[PDB]
Structure formats: C-alpha cells, structure tokens
Amino acid sequence: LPHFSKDDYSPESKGFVENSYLRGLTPQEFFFHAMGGREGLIDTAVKTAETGYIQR
Amino acid sequence: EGLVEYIDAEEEESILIAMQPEDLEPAEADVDPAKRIRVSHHATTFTHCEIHPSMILGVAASIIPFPDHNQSPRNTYQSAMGKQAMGVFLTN
Amino acid sequence: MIVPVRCFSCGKVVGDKWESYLNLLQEDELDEGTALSRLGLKRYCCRRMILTHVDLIEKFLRYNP
Amino acid sequence: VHRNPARLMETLRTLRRKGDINPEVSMIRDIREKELKIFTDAGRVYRPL
Amino acid sequence: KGSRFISTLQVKLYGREGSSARTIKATLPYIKQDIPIVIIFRALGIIPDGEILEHICYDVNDWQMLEMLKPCVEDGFVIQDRETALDFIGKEKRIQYAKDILQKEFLPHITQLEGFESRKAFFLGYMINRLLLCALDRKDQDDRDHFGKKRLDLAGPLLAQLFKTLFKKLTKDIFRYMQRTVE
Amino acid sequence: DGPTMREITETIAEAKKKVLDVTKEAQANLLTAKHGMTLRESFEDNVVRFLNEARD
Amino acid sequence: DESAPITAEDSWAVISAFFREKGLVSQQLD
Amino acid sequence: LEPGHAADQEQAKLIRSAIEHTTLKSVTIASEIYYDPDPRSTVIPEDEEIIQLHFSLQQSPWLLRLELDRAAMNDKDLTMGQVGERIKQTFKNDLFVIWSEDNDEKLIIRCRVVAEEDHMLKKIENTMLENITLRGVENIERVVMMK
Amino acid sequence: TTFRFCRDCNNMLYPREDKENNRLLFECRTCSYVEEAGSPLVYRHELITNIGETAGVVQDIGSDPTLPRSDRECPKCHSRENVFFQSQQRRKDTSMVLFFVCLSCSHIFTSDQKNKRTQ
RNA sequence: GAGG
DNA sequence: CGATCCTC
Ligand SMILES: [Zn+2]
Ligand SMILES: [Zn+2]
Ligand SMILES: [Zn+2]
C-alpha cells in the first residue's frame, strides 16, 4: 500500500491481521482481508463450475 | 488554495500517505485494551494524508454498520442484498 | 410516510404523539431522549417507533396536484 | 530530457496546486529511474487527498 | 483526438535463457517478416554501431547490456546505409513503401508526419533498453493488473465513438447527394 | 478476560520479535537456506510459520 | 486558533464540502 | 532407501546427490574468454600457481576461464577433479583442461582448443553450461531428504 | 569487459591476433583502423551477478519519500541521515541484504556481514 | 438480466 | 470442442 515504505516485509506490511473481529480491523488490515476474501469468492465460483462438469 | 489534491494510482506510486491526521503525525514520548491495535507512524517522510479511510468503500458497502468487525465475504454478500431491499426509492 | 398508529412490538398508541414531539424539540428546545420520555415512551420498542420515524408525507405533500 | 528535474517538478506541482495546470493532470516523478511522466488523458481514476 | 488508429509494436528477444546468439527483432505493420533492430535504426538514419547502441544503452559502464547487443551488431552487419536498410523491408517502389511504413505505421503515437525519425529511433531504443533491463534480470516483468495502466470509458467517450461514426456516414451521404447532382 | 487479552497481546508481540530477528539475520546474510529452496523462500516459509503459530 | 492542526473529526467537513459540490454521480455528468 | 540401513541420514545425502540432475551452469559464477597466448606463462597473475603444475604426473592462444561457486560445489557432492574429469570426458582430445585444487582460494577451470578461432570457444562454453550432465538423472530437477 | 569502437567510424571493433608477435589487437571492419587491446579479456558471461543491486543511486535519492530511513551510522562520515533498500537485482535467488545511501556524503554501505564489496 |  | 442448477 502507499502508506508503507519501500521494501517492508513486516507482519503488518504484508497482510497480518493482528486484530480480532471483536476489537475491529484497521484500514490496512481491512483491505488485506478484502484481498484474501475476494480470492476465496473467485474460486468458490470456479469450484462450483468445475466440479459440476467433473460430476457430469 | 492547494490544501487538497487529486491523485491517480500512477502518481500514488511516488507518494507516502498518513492514514490519520493526528494519529499519524503529532510526536512521541496507559492505553485502552478494548481499542484495536494500530501500529506506528515509523515512516515520517509523508507527502499526503488520507481524507478518511472509510472512503475506500462505495455506496453499497457505505451502508454496513462496522464492516471492520465482519468477515470479508459477509461484506460482499450484504453489498449484493441491499439491491434486493425495499423502501422509498424516490419521493415522486 | 406518516407516524405509524401504535408501536409494532407492544401496541402502545403512537399516532397522537408526533406533533407534540416536534414542539418539544422546537419550542421547548429539548433533546430527543428527554422528549421521548416526556411523551411517556418508556420502552425502547416505543422510543424507536418515533425516534426512527422518517416523515416522507411532508415531501409527498410538496407535489403540486 | 531534463537536467535539474527537482526544480522542474516543484514548479509543475506548484502550478497545478495554484490551478495554472488542470488538477486532474497527473505528474509522476521516478527519482531512481531518472523519469518524469505526465498524463492529461481521459479515463484515469483518481481520488482526492 | 484524431480517429482510433491502433497498431501494436513488438520488440522480440529471440534465443532462450541459456541459448548462445540471442538476437533482437521487431514487428512492423504490413511487413511479412521480422526485422533486425539495427536495420530499423539504419532505415531511420542512425548508421554507426556506436550511435545505434548509444540510443539503446544509456550508460557506457554497462558492458552486460552491451554484450547483449553484440549479436544485433552482427545480425545487420551486411547493411551499412539507410538506402539498403529501407530496401531490406519488402522496384525501388519497395523502398518508398518502407519509408512511408516507418512514418505512417511505425509508432503513430509520437508522430504520423515526416520530419522526425530521431524521436522514433530514440523511443525504439528506450523500448529495447526496457526489454533488456528485464532480460538481464534487473527488472520485474510488467504487471498487466496495475490499475493506473487501465482507463475507464464513460458516457462522453462512448458517445464520441458513435458520433464520429454516425457523422462520417452523414458526411458520406452529403457527398453521394452532391455526386448525384450532375444537373 | 482482561488478563487473557493481555496474554494474547504478548503472544503476538513475541511473533513480531521472532519475525524481526529472522529478518535482521536474513539482512546480515547469516540466514542459510537448506537444500532445494531460495534464501528468500526459506525466510518467507519461516515468517508465515511464526505468524500462523501466533494465531493458533 | 486558525493555524491549529486538524483532527479526524474535521475530515467530515472536507467530505461534506466534496459532495456539496460534486454530489454522488459526477463521473457521469463530468 | 535400501531396506538396511534406510534410516541412516548419511546414505540418503548420497542418493540425493546421485539422482539430482546437476549441470555446469549450476556451479559456475562467470565464464571468461581471455587472450592468453603463452601456455606456460599466464597473463592472469592469480592463475600463476595452477600453471606451475599440470606438466607431469600446439594448443590455442585463447583461454576459457570458469570461476566456480564454493557454496554450490558443497551443496552438490562435487569436487574440482570431478567437474574437471567430466569436462575432459566430453571433448576428449579437442580440448585441454587444467584446474585449481579443491583447497585453493578460488575455484578455477582453464580450457584451450586443440583461422576463425574467437567464435568456436564461445560456442564450446554454451555446450559446457547448458549441455553437460555432471551428475544426476535427467528430468530430476530437485531432490529433498525427508524423514 | 569494456569494449571500444573505431575512433573515426564509431562502429564495433573486432579482435585480431598478431600470430607473429602474439598480441591482442582490435580491427575495424568499416575501414582500415587497428589498435592494441588493453586487457586480454574478450568475453565475460557472469551467471551469478552482483551488478544492478545498487542500480538507481542518484543524488536526488534522499528526496524519494517512499524510501525508508534507517537509524544506522555511515562508516565514512558519521551521518545517521540515510535512505535504504534491498537489492534492485530483481531475480529469485537474491540476498535479503540491505544497501544504505548516506544522505550527507553519497557513501553506499551494506547490512551484509559475510561478503565485503567494491560496488 | 436476476435467484441459490 | 468443452465450461454448476433454477426461471426472467
Ligand atoms: Zn412499544
Ligand atoms: Zn572504422
Ligand atoms: Zn556518510
């Protein structure tokens, strides 16, 4: 993200959500969770299409 | 008056952004445990600041109460549903 | 779209309270919480009834016919 | 090309921040790649800061 | 602001990772086969090897990139002038087609005019520099998912496409009506 | 619990220290990857592990 | 003081300023 | 592993080294082509010690000099002699190979061909790096020892 | 390596052996030019490369706001004003090593404890 | 086009 | 030459 400095491999920098859904997620944490989340919705859509064909 | 300015992903590459005006740049020298974990300024070489982080969202997501306390797919699903909801669409 | 007559949850009549409520906020210059209590809306099912009512009839009446 | 791009870039931004260069115009200075890139073109999604 | 003319130029580094004699060849619109890079530079006006390489390599101290271009220097060794370079591409008439193809088809963004080539050759050089910069494992292959490199076509732009098309047909109809007016 | 939260917090801080040390070691060129994998790949595998461990 | 720095609450005035001029569908209109 | 004698960590390290496909490329830092005309008197002052030997128990004035990576040589169960005797058993007579000892500070291999010369040695270096199986089975790119 | 072009032509110079005197020379193929070589080195490959790690060190470097600043002391002057980055050699098998550019004397220093370096 |  | 089910 443009809130980080160049070459940052720190937990926080690369998608480590330190917070619980109770405590609440920070904007950075929020975005990274969304990025992970998306990938999951995409292959959910992929699995259902692919497995259905396999079954046939 | 040059207090605010327009940035696109290309120019975004060359700038360093603070998330909060205060909470991202006052100074340094006890805490609320209930409050979430917010890292450190650490980088100070800032050129800009975020008007408000919640603005990363759009119309549908803007309706959710505390999505920062929800699983990410649930915010996507809720976004789909608010478009199936009922209410006054217009006064006319 | 006008003060619902009666609280959905409990039944306490709320149709007679809207105008009195606005006056308490306007004239009397009270806050919503003291105003709701002044109208005798003790339960939260009754408080939400008035507090969250959006009066679109005023907008609808603004139309020329 | 340009020799003293630091001076050029400071003038360019000043003008856009004053108004003399359209606020939607993007000016990107890549210090390490010795590069100045400008876009006046339509289609670019931007956000205020 | 002048039509929607798209032509994609490719700068292709031949020879696999670990294959000796790695050559660089370019694709030109309406040209049957690939053309070695030095032949493009020669056909543009840049003749000496050192001057061609001066356009690609931006630092003298970079022998790595210079050894990367040694086979290109050999590839077009047989051509040492603009006349025979333009001739390569494609009577006599074949040279004009090539000259015209360099100004009209090759890099239409920059210019589609005549009196340039210097701007075109330098840019072609920038392109190769970038191709080598990656090939030399100094740079990361361009990300085709970077949002900044993507544009969004809205109401105006879409209407403009249609309007250009429609107005041209109208313009054409007026001319057919003019042509029919023989009396 | 107030005590429990305080302890989760310290668990995460120790993962942050392990991740910092492996990084500091990595940057000193003292980190030596085992056969079959990049010095970077091994570092990455390690960091992800400490972080996953911390969550559990 | 007029020179004093902004708080995160002060952000909402700028946001209000944004939409009071742009509204919500400026991309379309613009 | 062999029933034995299968739970021995050492024998495993060997079988891994016997099967993982290893090329000259995987062990080379750089390959240089110097103009060294005097075979006995070297222009490279580092190499002087190597030249003293390889005389007891006509060529080309062009030298091909490969510098090997100590780390890589130790990841694989490889020694200078092994690499050297393997380069020798490829060209047999059409190449002369000399080399640095395993103890020696820098790991060096020197090669000479046995009109139109400068092109040939560049062609040979390509065949050395990309086409010489030092040890291992072809297609077996990586091998991992797992308990 | 470091290779030259013809003084007059500005065309690539090619190797040539004396054979009689056994010495390295460089001939032009566009004209009749000939000059002696400096170093005997003709070709250098390099599969394990050190060049491009420090690529991008420009005097204006300290003005890049995205680059991080370390608390480190410059070995040359004792300036603690410096910017830093990891190897710009964008390859898979690369060191996690840092490079520091002292923002007071332009000195490039490294986090590396194993290798030395001459940049 | 929208629903799981 | 293929690419989940339903009806609008
Ligand atoms: Zn009630
Ligand atoms: Zn010459
Ligand atoms: Zn210094």
mmCIF file with all atom_site columns, C-alpha atoms in Angstrom, chain H residues 32-44 58-65 94-96 98 110-121, chain I residues 15-25 39-42:
data_model
loop_
_atom_site.group_PDB
_atom_site.id
_atom_site.type_symbol
_atom_site.label_atom_id
_atom_site.label_alt_id
_atom_site.label_comp_id
_atom_site.label_asym_id
_atom_site.label_entity_id
_atom_site.label_seq_id
_atom_site.pdbx_PDB_ins_code
_atom_site.Cartn_x
_atom_site.Cartn_y
_atom_site.Cartn_z
_atom_site.occupancy
_atom_site.B_iso_or_equiv
_atom_site.pdbx_formal_charge
_atom_site.auth_seq_id
_atom_site.auth_comp_id
_atom_site.auth_asym_id
_atom_site.auth_atom_id
_atom_site.pdbx_PDB_model_num
ATOM 1  C CA . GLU H 1 32  ? 35.636 -15.534 -19.263 1.00 0.00 ? 32  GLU H CA 1
ATOM 2  C CA . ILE H 1 33  ? 37.468 -15.710 -22.603 1.00 0.00 ? 33  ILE H CA 1
ATOM 3  C CA . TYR H 1 34  ? 40.973 -14.165 -22.283 1.00 0.00 ? 34  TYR H CA 1
ATOM 4  C CA . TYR H 1 35  ? 43.693 -13.913 -24.901 1.00 0.00 ? 35  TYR H CA 1
ATOM 5  C CA . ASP H 1 36  ? 46.414 -15.966 -23.136 1.00 0.00 ? 36  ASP H CA 1
ATOM 6  C CA . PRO H 1 37  ? 48.969 -16.911 -25.868 1.00 0.00 ? 37  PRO H CA 1
ATOM 7  C CA . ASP H 1 38  ? 51.870 -18.286 -23.760 1.00 0.00 ? 38  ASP H CA 1
ATOM 8  C CA . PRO H 1 39  ? 50.609 -21.611 -22.286 1.00 0.00 ? 39  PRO H CA 1
ATOM 9  C CA . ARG H 1 40  ? 53.487 -21.757 -19.708 1.00 0.00 ? 40  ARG H CA 1
ATOM 10 C CA . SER H 1 41  ? 53.434 -18.003 -18.827 1.00 0.00 ? 41  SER H CA 1
ATOM 11 C CA . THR H 1 42  ? 49.955 -16.791 -17.849 1.00 0.00 ? 42  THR H CA 1
ATOM 12 C CA . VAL H 1 43  ? 48.680 -13.170 -18.243 1.00 0.00 ? 43  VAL H CA 1
ATOM 13 C CA . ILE H 1 44  ? 46.328 -13.716 -15.197 1.00 0.00 ? 44  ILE H CA 1
ATOM 14 C CA . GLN H 1 58  ? 50.224 -26.921 -30.373 1.00 0.00 ? 58  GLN H CA 1
ATOM 15 C CA . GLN H 1 59  ? 47.112 -25.686 -28.421 1.00 0.00 ? 59  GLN H CA 1
ATOM 16 C CA . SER H 1 60  ? 45.201 -22.372 -28.882 1.00 0.00 ? 60  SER H CA 1
ATOM 17 C CA . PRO H 1 61  ? 46.289 -18.849 -27.781 1.00 0.00 ? 61  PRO H CA 1
ATOM 18 C CA . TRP H 1 62  ? 42.769 -18.326 -26.406 1.00 0.00 ? 62  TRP H CA 1
ATOM 19 C CA . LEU H 1 63  ? 41.855 -19.225 -22.823 1.00 0.00 ? 63  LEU H CA 1
ATOM 20 C CA . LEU H 1 64  ? 38.314 -20.103 -21.500 1.00 0.00 ? 64  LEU H CA 1
ATOM 21 C CA . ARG H 1 65  ? 38.247 -19.382 -17.745 1.00 0.00 ? 65  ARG H CA 1
ATOM 22 C CA . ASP H 1 94  ? 39.631 -31.473 -28.907 1.00 0.00 ? 94  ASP H CA 1
ATOM 23 C CA . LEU H 1 95  ? 40.087 -29.589 -25.563 1.00 0.00 ? 95  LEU H CA 1
ATOM 24 C CA . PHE H 1 96  ? 42.846 -29.225 -22.949 1.00 0.00 ? 96  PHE H CA 1
ATOM 25 C CA . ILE H 1 98  ? 43.777 -27.732 -16.323 1.00 0.00 ? 98  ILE H CA 1
ATOM 26 C CA . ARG H 1 110 ? 41.196 -23.302 -17.662 1.00 0.00 ? 110 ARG H CA 1
ATOM 27 C CA . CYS H 1 111 ? 40.359 -24.594 -21.196 1.00 0.00 ? 111 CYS H CA 1
ATOM 28 C CA . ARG H 1 112 ? 42.156 -24.449 -24.590 1.00 0.00 ? 112 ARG H CA 1
ATOM 29 C CA . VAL H 1 113 ? 41.151 -25.756 -28.080 1.00 0.00 ? 113 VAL H CA 1
ATOM 30 C CA . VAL H 1 114 ? 43.356 -28.436 -29.723 1.00 0.00 ? 114 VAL H CA 1
ATOM 31 C CA . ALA H 1 115 ? 41.758 -19.365 -38.650 1.00 0.00 ? 115 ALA H CA 1
ATOM 32 C CA . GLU H 1 116 ? 38.256 -18.200 -37.334 1.00 0.00 ? 116 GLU H CA 1
ATOM 33 C CA . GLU H 1 117 ? 39.062 -19.106 -33.646 1.00 0.00 ? 117 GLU H CA 1
ATOM 34 C CA . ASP H 1 118 ? 37.269 -16.484 -31.394 1.00 0.00 ? 118 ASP H CA 1
ATOM 35 C CA . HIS H 1 119 ? 33.786 -17.772 -32.472 1.00 0.00 ? 119 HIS H CA 1
ATOM 36 C CA . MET H 1 120 ? 34.475 -21.502 -31.660 1.00 0.00 ? 120 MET H CA 1
ATOM 37 C CA . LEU H 1 121 ? 35.364 -21.077 -27.931 1.00 0.00 ? 121 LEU H CA 1
ATOM 38 C CA . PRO I 2 15  ? 39.513 -8.972  -32.183 1.00 0.00 ? 15  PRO I CA 1
ATOM 39 C CA . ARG I 2 16  ? 42.648 -9.879  -34.155 1.00 0.00 ? 16  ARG I CA 1
ATOM 40 C CA . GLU I 2 17  ? 45.715 -11.855 -33.163 1.00 0.00 ? 17  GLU I CA 1
ATOM 41 C CA . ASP I 2 18  ? 49.256 -10.825 -34.262 1.00 0.00 ? 18  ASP I CA 1
ATOM 42 C CA . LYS I 2 19  ? 50.265 -14.536 -34.567 1.00 0.00 ? 19  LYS I CA 1
ATOM 43 C CA . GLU I 2 20  ? 53.860 -13.435 -35.428 1.00 0.00 ? 20  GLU I CA 1
ATOM 44 C CA . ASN I 2 21  ? 54.363 -11.330 -32.209 1.00 0.00 ? 21  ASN I CA 1
ATOM 45 C CA . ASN I 2 22  ? 51.442 -13.000 -30.319 1.00 0.00 ? 22  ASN I CA 1
ATOM 46 C CA . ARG I 2 23  ? 49.499 -9.934  -29.178 1.00 0.00 ? 23  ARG I CA 1
ATOM 47 C CA . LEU I 2 24  ? 45.864 -8.798  -28.946 1.00 0.00 ? 24  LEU I CA 1
ATOM 48 C CA . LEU I 2 25  ? 44.652 -6.144  -31.357 1.00 0.00 ? 25  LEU I CA 1
ATOM 49 C CA . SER I 2 39  ? 43.116 -6.124  -21.220 1.00 0.00 ? 39  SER I CA 1
ATOM 50 C CA . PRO I 2 40  ? 43.286 -9.692  -22.750 1.00 0.00 ? 40  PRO I CA 1
ATOM 51 C CA . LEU I 2 41  ? 39.656 -10.196 -21.629 1.00 0.00 ? 41  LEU I CA 1
ATOM 52 C CA . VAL I 2 42  ? 37.446 -10.630 -24.731 1.00 0.00 ? 42  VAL I CA 1
#
